Structure 1
């Protein structure tokens, strides 16, 4: 119960940063480099 004013702060900080990231990054990480003429993503050994 003493951890209630801390949870009401973590909830609101998460909600603020979620909306900031929704304003700044919405629909940006949708391109990638495939192989020319294919639908296979082109990466390297350990690269994700």
Structure 2
């Protein structure tokens, strides 16, 4: 019970840092590294 002045910070700090991410980074993650005309992702053995 002496932590809901501290846990209320991160929950307000997430809501701050979620919306900043959602404005700046909206939908950047979609472009591919596929092959020539096919449907395989192109990675190198260890790479995500």
| Bin of the TM-score, shorter chain as denominator length | over 0.9
The size of the alignment, in residue pairs, is 48
Consecutive unaligned residues in structure 2, runs of 5 or more: none
1:3-42 residue CA offsets vs partner (Å, 9 max, x unmatched): 0100110100001000000000010010021010101100
CA distance in 1, matches of 2:9, 2:22: 20
RMSD: 0.5
What's the TM-score once normalised by structure 1's chain length? 0.95
Normalized per residue, the structure richer in helix is 1
